[PDB]
């Protein structure tokens, strides 16, 4: 597969379209959401396309690897750990990524996995705490939506 | 994946949880559609993952091997034809199905493809007109999800 999109839906205002396209061996991420407080907020594949209790059902960040949380840019990161989205004043976030780990087919597959987008900042698992090794410390999940084949 | 679940939303007030799991070559699907009108709904694999716009976004029946529409112990069907679901009179239908054309993993994979169910009764290829062959004449797209990997 070398297409997938994404539809974010949660209890509040959040909302957005992710597309997905297989370039080289690399995934790029594309798309806009809106309804966001100015600023960074968190943003990864979680495990399972699991939508039964809302965003909750979708699991951990997708780690196969059972490694520690970071950023896109770390060795050591989850394979769904994709950094921060950055809403304007307009509560609107330009979604921009290629990622190199992430793939939409083989044992890296995030197609039938969970985008998620969070309240506050990813630190990149330097918080210096527990949590930020495996969350980022990114807090609640705003909204989330399955990852489905496209045209 | 060897189990997934997929989500039912629609505008209007069908709902329901459809569960997957693999045994052997077949899908075991179990789970439970509600807000249906008495009697027999149509219910697919549709092509794709896009809930961009609604059900409509889910293209057409799951049809890799291009085939006519069936029913599901048809040899002539497509990979998503799951036949016919019974609704209760208190507007509940418990889904109870084992196929072996439809997959979690490998070409026939449906994760990342949505389930729909449909206004009216599937008449399994059995219509006689042109929409009998393409669609079993099943009639609007009341609710659908994006199949996802579940744990
Ligand atoms: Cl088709
Ligand atoms: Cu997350
Ligand atoms: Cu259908
Ligand atoms: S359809
Ligand atoms: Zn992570
Ligand atoms: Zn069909």
Tied chains: 1, 2.
């Excluded at 509040?12 to 407080?37: N, R």
């Amino acid at each position: 597969a070398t297409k997938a999109v994404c539809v974010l839906k949660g209890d509040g205002p959040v909302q957005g379209t992710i597309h997905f396209e297989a370039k080289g061996d690399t995934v790029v991420v594309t798309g806009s959401i809106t309804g966001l407080t100015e600023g960074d907020h968190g943003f990864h594949v979680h495990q399972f396309g699991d939508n039964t209790q809302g965003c909750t059902s979708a699991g951990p960040h997708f780690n196969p690897l059972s490694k520690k949380h970071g950023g896109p840019k770390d060795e050591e990161r989850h394979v769904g750990d994709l950094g921060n989205v950055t809403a304007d004043k307009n509560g609107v976030a330009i979604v921009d990524i290629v990622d190199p780990l992430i793939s939409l087919s083989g044992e890296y597959s995030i197609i039938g996995r969970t985008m998620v987008v969070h309240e506050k900042p990813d630190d990149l698992g330097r918080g210096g705490n527990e949590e930020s090794t495996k969350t980022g410390n990114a807090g609640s999940r705003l909204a989330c939506g399955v990852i489905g084949i496209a045209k």
